[PDB]
């Protein structure tokens, strides 16, 4: 006969049921009162609760839970409700809801035992239907259902502190820019000088076979170190294109188009990086297409470079951080660096079974978040650096490529607020978050990446 | 110092015309878009497995809570979320007593073992649903944990069983009692094999959502879809069974705003190229498949389709696009988009441990972009990606289309997935089950499959 329905609960403990009931009741049209919808409020909250109980409610239905059975706030609001029920002779003003399956009649409150409770522990829908028909059978005021109100309240209460905010912040990529390039790229017409059966990529300097020519950044007489009878070669028949011209794209001729030139330069960059990694006192690991490079045990100050552990123990084996490089030119000349983890017994003789390697790589990276990725990657890049702020790729005797140490700094206009340390239990459950059905082929998922 | 663009979360539509980002919260607050009058479920499984199914059904009505309940919300109960009844009274159970199971466990060839088990399950299902008039809404086939444990590293059960029952045009759902009663499964020292005590609520959520979708009901759909637009994507598979490698299988997957896609089978053709690895259809069968999909849309909507958004992890040559343009009418926009996730562009944060969001975009040109479909979620206060996310690289291979438009559309399309009730999945649904649907196709190749919904 009054205005709105009111419900109390043990807010610190049973918020799930109160949430469900409140949104389901407001969705059907009943104007609900509970402390859940009043988030970010409460100084004299008890006074407001007492006022709305006294003169702003027709219903008061309350949880009957072990936590809420003896809570002081629940007890005091229940006492105020009993006073209001004594005032208004309606004996159904108090509706216990037995959602708790281990609260017998012995420990239920004295003035709640004799009352008739509607069962919610069997199923919330059956209890909701019982409450609805009870509301109808003493003419509880109702509004036509409008779930728009439920949507508005749910997003502005349970989703107000967990939304992306508008403020600019920067990130850190693995796209390392190339500071400078050699002056020119030269195709030499070795012809009879260079045998076709010989594998060009095995040469000391980066050289890849293009038709009958040989395209390198080196010099014609620079390559006489390992292969003879090329001192007779002349610099006239060789064709040189300025690197800035060929990479820009404005260069185009019947000999070579701008499409294959960039791919050739990318392959040259990859080969140069692979050759340069030979003398950087790192160890190599073969992959499907590229190579990975890591640090052996005992090659650093307790295997730590600038307070960062690139190598660490785990159970009965060792893990080492490693990188793989691959160049690209279209969105400015950059080098992608991909981070991987390589497993070993102590510091040498990597595990022959790559299956264990890739399987336990996930369990070794499960506990490494953004910081333990970026810091290790930057530490590895700084370690591989030779001078202050660059890495030198020796392509020629006088020509070398410079790769900047600092990667490109992207920035986004949308940020958020980092919460407290919540991940502690995640790694336990993401080992099972793929086990919700376990039907998906885990082995095929890894193979599907290729 | 490059720029980044954030695309707002695409809301999905629920019952009573309600749209919200989280499928679980929307379902629990408003229910599925189209209600149904109950799930007359039929279950095939062992007597003990039948007891597991009954116990789980009893457990569903009572609420289930996760450990944190902030990243994996609560489970109110079946009739509380869906407004329909499904329990152990209106149940049509088929006796598959383990005597025949131990007879069929005598084989040693894993392929033959899973094949014969799938045939026995298929025969039981078809006999049950054709011998009598009891309309079983969903056939919940519960595989004993021994069967799958001894027959799992075709070899998978789900793909071939689904292929057989779609040949028989019959809905089904595969479940495991370990997924159902993990508490009853323990290792040597009594610890659970898979501790779901922290994710029990989400387990019930995903099982309930899959069960409801399999009953002909549509849980949700994209609520901010463009008027009169479809998305016809594509899936390939290589048939290694044949001695000649070039032959391959293809399948179109057409998705409307509803999210219940339609799979059109394609004839076997020589498209596997061992040199480059990117497959291309010959013009004849490609145009045949495109005409089939176009006519399916025409009969399903009394109008021509407008967006054959051929999504693939490969490229299309010139003759494929010439054939597609020839098939499509003049007043139709044709766009072929290549989507891949192997390009390393990990954007580590400056400080902290929580990675970048899901939904950040990086524009490269007018045809290529990077979309972050993994990582931290502001609402979930957690990360869908396990480690630092790697964005998916999308590229408009051919045709003219705004890059932000296709970015938002592909994000919204990733938001639509019924087989697993999660906030989102990184790969698009058109490619989510690409491996699964490809294995379904290669399981039943010579069978002529008419245009049928994704639930089969």
mmCIF file of N, CA, C and O in Angstrom, chain A residues 16 19-20 24 124 147 150-151 154 162 164 169-172 174-175 330 336 339 361 365-366 369-371 373-374 409 411 414-416 419 423 429-430 432-433 435-436 438-439 441 448-449, chain B residues 1-4 16 18 25 28 30 63 65 72 74 76 80 152 156 158 179 194-196 202-203 342 344-350 352-355 357 365 368 378-379 381 386-388 435-436:
data_model
loop_
_atom_site.group_PDB
_atom_site.id
_atom_site.type_symbol
_atom_site.label_atom_id
_atom_site.label_comp_id
_atom_site.label_asym_id
_atom_site.label_seq_id
_atom_site.Cartn_x
_atom_site.Cartn_y
_atom_site.Cartn_z
ATOM 1 N N UNK A 16 25.920 -10.879 -4.149
ATOM 2 C CA UNK A 16 25.489 -11.460 -5.416
ATOM 3 C C UNK A 16 23.973 -11.627 -5.463
ATOM 4 O O UNK A 16 23.321 -11.214 -6.432
ATOM 5 N N UNK A 19 22.275 -8.210 -5.543
ATOM 6 C CA UNK A 19 22.363 -7.653 -6.888
ATOM 7 C C UNK A 19 21.327 -8.286 -7.808
ATOM 8 O O UNK A 19 20.558 -7.584 -8.480
ATOM 9 N N UNK A 20 21.289 -9.619 -7.845
ATOM 10 C CA UNK A 20 20.352 -10.298 -8.733
ATOM 11 C C UNK A 20 18.920 -9.886 -8.429
ATOM 12 O O UNK A 20 18.166 -9.511 -9.333
ATOM 13 N N UNK A 24 16.551 -7.684 -10.917
ATOM 14 C CA UNK A 24 15.378 -8.387 -11.427
ATOM 15 C C UNK A 24 14.088 -7.702 -10.992
ATOM 16 O O UNK A 24 13.112 -7.671 -11.749
ATOM 17 N N UNK A 124 16.411 -19.562 -7.692
ATOM 18 C CA UNK A 124 16.072 -18.147 -7.581
ATOM 19 C C UNK A 124 14.825 -17.795 -8.381
ATOM 20 O O UNK A 124 14.060 -16.916 -7.974
ATOM 21 N N UNK A 147 13.167 -2.502 -18.696
ATOM 22 C CA UNK A 147 14.538 -2.931 -18.461
ATOM 23 C C UNK A 147 15.559 -1.853 -18.798
ATOM 24 O O UNK A 147 16.743 -2.030 -18.492
ATOM 25 N N UNK A 150 16.903 -0.791 -15.558
ATOM 26 C CA UNK A 150 17.871 -1.758 -15.052
ATOM 27 C C UNK A 150 19.216 -1.607 -15.747
ATOM 28 O O UNK A 150 20.268 -1.676 -15.101
ATOM 29 N N UNK A 151 19.205 -1.409 -17.068
ATOM 30 C CA UNK A 151 20.455 -1.203 -17.792
ATOM 31 C C UNK A 151 21.159 0.065 -17.326
ATOM 32 O O UNK A 151 22.381 0.072 -17.135
ATOM 33 N N UNK A 154 22.534 -0.565 -13.687
ATOM 34 C CA UNK A 154 23.609 -1.549 -13.614
ATOM 35 C C UNK A 154 24.929 -0.972 -14.107
ATOM 36 O O UNK A 154 25.981 -1.203 -13.500
ATOM 37 N N UNK A 162 35.052 0.931 -13.453
ATOM 38 C CA UNK A 162 35.755 -0.032 -14.292
ATOM 39 C C UNK A 162 35.520 0.272 -15.766
ATOM 40 O O UNK A 162 35.168 -0.598 -16.562
ATOM 41 N N UNK A 164 37.128 2.609 -19.269
ATOM 42 C CA UNK A 164 38.298 3.281 -19.816
ATOM 43 C C UNK A 164 38.138 4.792 -19.698
ATOM 44 O O UNK A 164 37.096 5.346 -20.061
ATOM 45 N N UNK A 169 48.449 8.441 -22.738
ATOM 46 C CA UNK A 169 49.590 7.761 -22.143
ATOM 47 C C UNK A 169 50.329 6.986 -23.223
ATOM 48 O O UNK A 169 49.729 6.523 -24.196
ATOM 49 N N UNK A 170 51.635 6.833 -23.033
ATOM 50 C CA UNK A 170 52.500 6.217 -24.027
ATOM 51 C C UNK A 170 52.833 4.778 -23.650
ATOM 52 O O UNK A 170 52.686 4.357 -22.500
ATOM 53 N N UNK A 171 53.288 4.026 -24.650
ATOM 54 C CA UNK A 171 53.670 2.630 -24.478
ATOM 55 C C UNK A 171 55.083 2.410 -25.000
ATOM 56 O O UNK A 171 55.781 3.369 -25.340
ATOM 57 N N UNK A 172 55.512 1.152 -25.069
ATOM 58 C CA UNK A 172 56.834 0.812 -25.582
ATOM 59 C C UNK A 172 56.688 -0.346 -26.553
ATOM 60 O O UNK A 172 56.138 -1.392 -26.196
ATOM 61 N N UNK A 174 58.326 -2.943 -29.856
ATOM 62 C CA UNK A 174 59.529 -3.670 -30.235
ATOM 63 C C UNK A 174 59.992 -3.295 -31.638
ATOM 64 O O UNK A 174 60.846 -3.978 -32.212
ATOM 65 N N UNK A 175 59.440 -2.221 -32.198
ATOM 66 C CA UNK A 175 59.870 -1.690 -33.490
ATOM 67 C C UNK A 175 61.046 -0.757 -33.243
ATOM 68 O O UNK A 175 60.865 0.395 -32.840
ATOM 69 N N UNK A 330 58.172 -0.638 -45.184
ATOM 70 C CA UNK A 330 57.031 0.153 -45.646
ATOM 71 C C UNK A 330 56.576 1.207 -44.642
ATOM 72 O O UNK A 330 56.448 2.380 -45.033
ATOM 73 N N UNK A 336 61.599 -5.446 -36.292
ATOM 74 C CA UNK A 336 60.800 -6.137 -35.294
ATOM 75 C C UNK A 336 61.697 -7.043 -34.469
ATOM 76 O O UNK A 336 62.538 -7.766 -35.019
ATOM 77 N N UNK A 339 60.193 -11.658 -28.709
ATOM 78 C CA UNK A 339 60.756 -12.174 -27.470
ATOM 79 C C UNK A 339 60.346 -13.626 -27.274
ATOM 80 O O UNK A 339 59.177 -13.978 -27.462
ATOM 81 N N UNK A 361 57.184 -23.276 -21.993
ATOM 82 C CA UNK A 361 57.343 -21.846 -22.234
ATOM 83 C C UNK A 361 56.129 -21.071 -21.739
ATOM 84 O O UNK A 361 56.266 -19.977 -21.181
ATOM 85 N N UNK A 365 56.204 -18.196 -18.887
ATOM 86 C CA UNK A 365 55.741 -16.849 -19.146
ATOM 87 C C UNK A 365 54.443 -16.475 -18.476
ATOM 88 O O UNK A 365 54.024 -15.319 -18.568
ATOM 89 N N UNK A 366 53.787 -17.430 -17.811
ATOM 90 C CA UNK A 366 52.515 -17.130 -17.160
ATOM 91 C C UNK A 366 52.671 -16.086 -16.063
ATOM 92 O O UNK A 366 51.744 -15.307 -15.814
ATOM 93 N N UNK A 369 54.473 -10.457 -16.467
ATOM 94 C CA UNK A 369 53.557 -9.470 -17.015
ATOM 95 C C UNK A 369 54.326 -8.380 -17.759
ATOM 96 O O UNK A 369 55.510 -8.524 -18.075
ATOM 97 N N UNK A 370 53.633 -7.271 -18.040
ATOM 98 C CA UNK A 370 54.160 -6.218 -18.906
ATOM 99 C C UNK A 370 55.553 -5.762 -18.488
ATOM 100 O O UNK A 370 56.439 -5.597 -19.335
ATOM 101 N N UNK A 371 55.766 -5.543 -17.189
ATOM 102 C CA UNK A 371 57.073 -5.078 -16.734
ATOM 103 C C UNK A 371 58.153 -6.127 -16.977
ATOM 104 O O UNK A 371 59.225 -5.814 -17.510
ATOM 105 N N UNK A 373 58.358 -8.233 -19.144
ATOM 106 C CA UNK A 373 58.616 -8.377 -20.569
ATOM 107 C C UNK A 373 59.386 -7.190 -21.124
ATOM 108 O O UNK A 373 60.434 -7.366 -21.754
ATOM 109 N N UNK A 374 58.884 -5.976 -20.887
ATOM 110 C CA UNK A 374 59.531 -4.784 -21.421
ATOM 111 C C UNK A 374 60.929 -4.603 -20.846
ATOM 112 O O UNK A 374 61.872 -4.294 -21.586
ATOM 113 N N UNK A 409 57.994 4.964 -29.758
ATOM 114 C CA UNK A 409 57.109 5.229 -28.627
ATOM 115 C C UNK A 409 55.722 5.585 -29.155
ATOM 116 O O UNK A 409 55.432 6.743 -29.454
ATOM 117 N N UNK A 411 51.655 6.112 -28.589
ATOM 118 C CA UNK A 411 50.887 6.691 -27.497
ATOM 119 C C UNK A 411 49.407 6.646 -27.844
ATOM 120 O O UNK A 411 49.024 6.868 -28.996
ATOM 121 N N UNK A 414 43.487 6.997 -24.876
ATOM 122 C CA UNK A 414 42.609 6.367 -23.900
ATOM 123 C C UNK A 414 43.457 5.607 -22.890
ATOM 124 O O UNK A 414 44.321 4.814 -23.278
ATOM 125 N N UNK A 415 43.210 5.847 -21.602
ATOM 126 C CA UNK A 415 43.946 5.144 -20.558
ATOM 127 C C UNK A 415 42.977 4.481 -19.590
ATOM 128 O O UNK A 415 41.770 4.437 -19.846
ATOM 129 N N UNK A 416 43.489 3.947 -18.486
ATOM 130 C CA UNK A 416 42.642 3.386 -17.445
ATOM 131 C C UNK A 416 43.366 3.518 -16.112
ATOM 132 O O UNK A 416 44.480 4.043 -16.036
ATOM 133 N N UNK A 419 44.303 -1.382 -11.187
ATOM 134 C CA UNK A 419 43.860 -1.801 -9.855
ATOM 135 C C UNK A 419 45.015 -2.424 -9.080
ATOM 136 O O UNK A 419 46.160 -2.450 -9.526
ATOM 137 N N UNK A 423 46.285 -10.355 -9.992
ATOM 138 C CA UNK A 423 46.681 -11.477 -10.834
ATOM 139 C C UNK A 423 47.136 -12.697 -10.045
ATOM 140 O O UNK A 423 47.302 -13.761 -10.648
ATOM 141 N N UNK A 429 44.295 -20.106 -12.593
ATOM 142 C CA UNK A 429 43.056 -20.398 -13.308
ATOM 143 C C UNK A 429 43.185 -20.313 -14.828
ATOM 144 O O UNK A 429 42.387 -20.942 -15.536
ATOM 145 N N UNK A 430 44.157 -19.563 -15.355
ATOM 146 C CA UNK A 430 44.359 -19.588 -16.800
ATOM 147 C C UNK A 430 44.979 -20.898 -17.268
ATOM 148 O O UNK A 430 44.883 -21.223 -18.456
ATOM 149 N N UNK A 432 43.565 -23.445 -16.333
ATOM 150 C CA UNK A 432 42.296 -24.135 -16.490
ATOM 151 C C UNK A 432 41.256 -23.323 -17.248
ATOM 152 O O UNK A 432 40.176 -23.850 -17.536
ATOM 153 N N UNK A 433 41.543 -22.059 -17.574
ATOM 154 C CA UNK A 433 40.589 -21.253 -18.327
ATOM 155 C C UNK A 433 40.428 -21.767 -19.751
ATOM 156 O O UNK A 433 39.429 -21.456 -20.409
ATOM 157 N N UNK A 435 40.386 -25.036 -20.073
ATOM 158 C CA UNK A 435 39.833 -26.341 -19.748
ATOM 159 C C UNK A 435 38.327 -26.299 -19.520
ATOM 160 O O UNK A 435 37.759 -27.282 -19.035
ATOM 161 N N UNK A 436 37.672 -25.181 -19.851
ATOM 162 C CA UNK A 436 36.226 -25.083 -19.670
ATOM 163 C C UNK A 436 35.490 -26.173 -20.437
ATOM 164 O O UNK A 436 34.409 -26.604 -20.021
ATOM 165 N N UNK A 438 37.825 -28.327 -22.672
ATOM 166 C CA UNK A 438 38.985 -29.180 -22.926
ATOM 167 C C UNK A 438 38.874 -29.881 -24.276
ATOM 168 O O UNK A 438 39.726 -30.702 -24.632
ATOM 169 N N UNK A 439 37.829 -29.556 -25.038
ATOM 170 C CA UNK A 439 37.628 -30.168 -26.343
ATOM 171 C C UNK A 439 38.554 -29.578 -27.396
ATOM 172 O O UNK A 439 38.970 -30.290 -28.316
ATOM 173 N N UNK A 441 41.670 -28.592 -29.417
ATOM 174 C CA UNK A 441 42.971 -29.241 -29.559
ATOM 175 C C UNK A 441 44.064 -28.238 -29.215
ATOM 176 O O UNK A 441 44.346 -27.318 -29.986
ATOM 177 N N UNK A 448 48.313 -23.872 -35.445
ATOM 178 C CA UNK A 448 47.503 -22.962 -36.245
ATOM 179 C C UNK A 448 48.100 -21.564 -36.342
ATOM 180 O O UNK A 448 47.638 -20.772 -37.171
ATOM 181 N N UNK A 449 49.101 -21.241 -35.520
ATOM 182 C CA UNK A 449 49.739 -19.929 -35.601
ATOM 183 C C UNK A 449 50.421 -19.752 -36.952
ATOM 184 O O UNK A 449 50.338 -18.685 -37.571
ATOM 185 N N UNK B 1 56.847 8.378 -32.450
ATOM 186 C CA UNK B 1 55.763 9.032 -31.728
ATOM 187 C C UNK B 1 54.468 8.913 -32.525
ATOM 188 O O UNK B 1 53.770 9.900 -32.752
ATOM 189 N N UNK B 2 54.156 7.693 -32.951
ATOM 190 C CA UNK B 2 52.983 7.467 -33.780
ATOM 191 C C UNK B 2 51.708 7.549 -32.946
ATOM 192 O O UNK B 2 51.730 7.493 -31.714
ATOM 193 N N UNK B 3 50.584 7.685 -33.640
ATOM 194 C CA UNK B 3 49.286 7.840 -33.004
ATOM 195 C C UNK B 3 48.579 6.496 -32.868
ATOM 196 O O UNK B 3 48.844 5.546 -33.607
ATOM 197 N N UNK B 4 47.664 6.434 -31.904
ATOM 198 C CA UNK B 4 46.802 5.280 -31.698
ATOM 199 C C UNK B 4 45.362 5.754 -31.576
ATOM 200 O O UNK B 4 45.094 6.864 -31.109
ATOM 201 N N UNK B 16 14.136 -7.849 -24.622
ATOM 202 C CA UNK B 16 13.448 -6.597 -24.309
ATOM 203 C C UNK B 16 14.177 -5.387 -24.885
ATOM 204 O O UNK B 16 14.084 -4.281 -24.350
ATOM 205 N N UNK B 18 17.451 -4.691 -25.018
ATOM 206 C CA UNK B 18 18.481 -4.218 -24.105
ATOM 207 C C UNK B 18 19.854 -4.568 -24.660
ATOM 208 O O UNK B 18 20.081 -5.701 -25.094
ATOM 209 N N UNK B 25 26.498 -10.701 -18.173
ATOM 210 C CA UNK B 25 25.680 -9.757 -17.420
ATOM 211 C C UNK B 25 24.361 -9.484 -18.129
ATOM 212 O O UNK B 25 23.304 -9.435 -17.489
ATOM 213 N N UNK B 28 22.100 -12.516 -17.655
ATOM 214 C CA UNK B 28 21.599 -12.631 -16.291
ATOM 215 C C UNK B 28 20.595 -11.535 -15.961
ATOM 216 O O UNK B 28 19.715 -11.739 -15.117
ATOM 217 N N UNK B 30 18.594 -9.721 -18.370
ATOM 218 C CA UNK B 30 17.458 -9.589 -19.274
ATOM 219 C C UNK B 30 17.061 -10.871 -19.988
ATOM 220 O O UNK B 30 15.903 -10.981 -20.403
ATOM 221 N N UNK B 63 22.234 -21.140 -7.333
ATOM 222 C CA UNK B 63 23.291 -20.264 -7.851
ATOM 223 C C UNK B 63 24.678 -20.855 -7.657
ATOM 224 O O UNK B 63 24.930 -21.636 -6.736
ATOM 225 N N UNK B 65 28.808 -19.534 -7.609
ATOM 226 C CA UNK B 65 29.662 -18.364 -7.463
ATOM 227 C C UNK B 65 31.111 -18.729 -7.760
ATOM 228 O O UNK B 65 31.590 -19.792 -7.354
ATOM 229 N N UNK B 72 34.662 -13.081 -13.472
ATOM 230 C CA UNK B 72 33.800 -14.187 -13.888
ATOM 231 C C UNK B 72 32.516 -14.087 -13.077
ATOM 232 O O UNK B 72 32.421 -14.641 -11.974
ATOM 233 N N UNK B 74 28.613 -14.141 -11.469
ATOM 234 C CA UNK B 74 27.848 -15.213 -10.855
ATOM 235 C C UNK B 74 26.928 -15.892 -11.867
ATOM 236 O O UNK B 74 26.695 -15.397 -12.972
ATOM 237 N N UNK B 76 23.125 -16.994 -11.798
ATOM 238 C CA UNK B 76 21.879 -16.983 -11.011
ATOM 239 C C UNK B 76 21.132 -18.306 -11.005
ATOM 240 O O UNK B 76 20.559 -18.683 -9.975
ATOM 241 N N UNK B 80 16.415 -18.532 -13.901
ATOM 242 C CA UNK B 80 16.618 -17.137 -13.536
ATOM 243 C C UNK B 80 17.235 -16.332 -14.672
ATOM 244 O O UNK B 80 16.941 -15.139 -14.809
ATOM 245 N N UNK B 152 42.808 -38.956 -27.243
ATOM 246 C CA UNK B 152 43.114 -37.545 -27.458
ATOM 247 C C UNK B 152 44.556 -37.257 -27.059
ATOM 248 O O UNK B 152 44.968 -37.584 -25.939
ATOM 249 N N UNK B 156 39.881 -36.192 -33.184
ATOM 250 C CA UNK B 156 38.909 -35.499 -32.353
ATOM 251 C C UNK B 156 37.516 -36.081 -32.564
ATOM 252 O O UNK B 156 37.184 -36.583 -33.639
ATOM 253 N N UNK B 158 34.498 -34.235 -31.512
ATOM 254 C CA UNK B 158 33.508 -33.187 -31.738
ATOM 255 C C UNK B 158 33.313 -32.917 -33.222
ATOM 256 O O UNK B 158 32.179 -32.846 -33.708
ATOM 257 N N UNK B 179 34.286 -32.286 -16.972
ATOM 258 C CA UNK B 179 33.792 -30.918 -17.047
ATOM 259 C C UNK B 179 32.546 -30.728 -16.190
ATOM 260 O O UNK B 179 32.273 -29.609 -15.740
ATOM 261 N N UNK B 194 41.196 -31.051 -12.467
ATOM 262 C CA UNK B 194 41.060 -29.679 -12.953
ATOM 263 C C UNK B 194 40.265 -28.907 -11.906
ATOM 264 O O UNK B 194 39.043 -29.055 -11.814
ATOM 265 N N UNK B 195 40.956 -28.089 -11.120
ATOM 266 C CA UNK B 195 40.330 -27.365 -10.017
ATOM 267 C C UNK B 195 39.445 -26.261 -10.578
ATOM 268 O O UNK B 195 39.924 -25.189 -10.949
ATOM 269 N N UNK B 196 38.144 -26.525 -10.643
ATOM 270 C CA UNK B 196 37.165 -25.545 -11.088
ATOM 271 C C UNK B 196 36.497 -24.817 -9.931
ATOM 272 O O UNK B 196 35.541 -24.068 -10.157
ATOM 273 N N UNK B 202 31.604 -19.635 -14.013
ATOM 274 C CA UNK B 202 31.815 -19.445 -15.444
ATOM 275 C C UNK B 202 31.657 -20.748 -16.216
ATOM 276 O O UNK B 202 31.211 -20.733 -17.370
ATOM 277 N N UNK B 203 32.028 -21.875 -15.610
ATOM 278 C CA UNK B 203 31.799 -23.167 -16.248
ATOM 279 C C UNK B 203 30.311 -23.402 -16.470
ATOM 280 O O UNK B 203 29.882 -23.787 -17.569
ATOM 281 N N UNK B 342 50.111 -12.884 -36.795
ATOM 282 C CA UNK B 342 51.496 -13.299 -36.616
ATOM 283 C C UNK B 342 52.484 -12.149 -36.775
ATOM 284 O O UNK B 342 53.696 -12.389 -36.809
ATOM 285 N N UNK B 344 54.530 -9.215 -35.286
ATOM 286 C CA UNK B 344 54.899 -8.749 -33.943
ATOM 287 C C UNK B 344 54.837 -7.237 -33.798
ATOM 288 O O UNK B 344 55.681 -6.519 -34.344
ATOM 289 N N UNK B 345 53.840 -6.745 -33.070
ATOM 290 C CA UNK B 345 53.733 -5.328 -32.736
ATOM 291 C C UNK B 345 53.292 -5.180 -31.281
ATOM 292 O O UNK B 345 52.390 -4.412 -30.948
ATOM 293 N N UNK B 346 53.922 -5.946 -30.395
ATOM 294 C CA UNK B 346 53.587 -5.882 -28.979
ATOM 295 C C UNK B 346 53.919 -4.504 -28.422
ATOM 296 O O UNK B 346 55.061 -4.043 -28.520
ATOM 297 N N UNK B 347 52.919 -3.843 -27.844
ATOM 298 C CA UNK B 347 53.080 -2.504 -27.276
ATOM 299 C C UNK B 347 53.102 -2.632 -25.758
ATOM 300 O O UNK B 347 52.069 -2.552 -25.093
ATOM 301 N N UNK B 348 54.294 -2.835 -25.208
ATOM 302 C CA UNK B 348 54.443 -2.910 -23.764
ATOM 303 C C UNK B 348 54.171 -1.553 -23.125
ATOM 304 O O UNK B 348 54.502 -0.502 -23.679
ATOM 305 N N UNK B 349 53.555 -1.583 -21.947
ATOM 306 C CA UNK B 349 53.255 -0.355 -21.231
ATOM 307 C C UNK B 349 54.519 0.230 -20.609
ATOM 308 O O UNK B 349 55.506 -0.470 -20.364
ATOM 309 N N UNK B 350 54.479 1.541 -20.361
ATOM 310 C CA UNK B 350 55.641 2.226 -19.804
ATOM 311 C C UNK B 350 55.964 1.726 -18.401
ATOM 312 O O UNK B 350 57.136 1.531 -18.060
ATOM 313 N N UNK B 352 54.210 -0.614 -14.760
ATOM 314 C CA UNK B 352 53.193 -1.505 -14.237
ATOM 315 C C UNK B 352 53.265 -2.882 -14.864
ATOM 316 O O UNK B 352 54.135 -3.195 -15.682
ATOM 317 N N UNK B 353 52.312 -3.723 -14.456
ATOM 318 C CA UNK B 353 52.233 -5.092 -14.939
ATOM 319 C C UNK B 353 51.029 -5.360 -15.830
ATOM 320 O O UNK B 353 51.066 -6.311 -16.616
ATOM 321 N N UNK B 354 49.981 -4.558 -15.736
ATOM 322 C CA UNK B 354 48.775 -4.808 -16.515
ATOM 323 C C UNK B 354 48.962 -4.318 -17.947
ATOM 324 O O UNK B 354 49.309 -3.151 -18.155
ATOM 325 N N UNK B 355 48.739 -5.169 -18.950
ATOM 326 C CA UNK B 355 49.035 -4.783 -20.337
ATOM 327 C C UNK B 355 48.042 -3.791 -20.921
ATOM 328 O O UNK B 355 47.161 -3.281 -20.222
ATOM 329 N N UNK B 357 44.971 -2.297 -23.411
ATOM 330 C CA UNK B 357 43.567 -2.688 -23.434
ATOM 331 C C UNK B 357 43.303 -3.655 -24.583
ATOM 332 O O UNK B 357 44.205 -4.086 -25.305
ATOM 333 N N UNK B 365 48.026 2.395 -43.074
ATOM 334 C CA UNK B 365 47.713 3.048 -44.337
ATOM 335 C C UNK B 365 46.196 3.055 -44.489
ATOM 336 O O UNK B 365 45.462 2.860 -43.514
ATOM 337 N N UNK B 368 45.578 -1.166 -44.376
ATOM 338 C CA UNK B 368 46.086 -2.064 -43.349
ATOM 339 C C UNK B 368 46.015 -1.393 -41.986
ATOM 340 O O UNK B 368 46.133 -0.170 -41.872
ATOM 341 N N UNK B 378 38.849 -2.878 -19.196
ATOM 342 C CA UNK B 378 38.494 -2.016 -18.057
ATOM 343 C C UNK B 378 37.366 -2.572 -17.209
ATOM 344 O O UNK B 378 37.417 -2.470 -15.979
ATOM 345 N N UNK B 379 36.351 -3.175 -17.832
ATOM 346 C CA UNK B 379 35.220 -3.692 -17.069
ATOM 347 C C UNK B 379 35.605 -4.933 -16.275
ATOM 348 O O UNK B 379 35.287 -5.045 -15.086
ATOM 349 N N UNK B 381 38.474 -5.874 -15.258
ATOM 350 C CA UNK B 381 39.606 -5.656 -14.356
ATOM 351 C C UNK B 381 40.590 -6.819 -14.432
ATOM 352 O O UNK B 381 41.187 -7.228 -13.434
ATOM 353 N N UNK B 386 46.825 -13.948 -22.076
ATOM 354 C CA UNK B 386 47.498 -14.563 -20.939
ATOM 355 C C UNK B 386 48.813 -13.838 -20.660
ATOM 356 O O UNK B 386 49.080 -13.422 -19.527
ATOM 357 N N UNK B 387 49.640 -13.676 -21.689
ATOM 358 C CA UNK B 387 50.824 -12.834 -21.665
ATOM 359 C C UNK B 387 50.513 -11.510 -22.365
ATOM 360 O O UNK B 387 49.355 -11.192 -22.648
ATOM 361 N N UNK B 388 51.550 -10.718 -22.628
ATOM 362 C CA UNK B 388 51.367 -9.439 -23.328
ATOM 363 C C UNK B 388 50.704 -9.689 -24.678
ATOM 364 O O UNK B 388 51.176 -10.546 -25.451
ATOM 365 N N UNK B 435 39.652 -23.897 -37.846
ATOM 366 C CA UNK B 435 40.221 -25.236 -37.732
ATOM 367 C C UNK B 435 39.136 -26.273 -37.468
ATOM 368 O O UNK B 435 39.120 -27.343 -38.092
ATOM 369 N N UNK B 436 38.213 -25.969 -36.553
ATOM 370 C CA UNK B 436 37.154 -26.916 -36.218
ATOM 371 C C UNK B 436 36.236 -27.162 -37.409
ATOM 372 O O UNK B 436 35.918 -28.312 -37.732
#
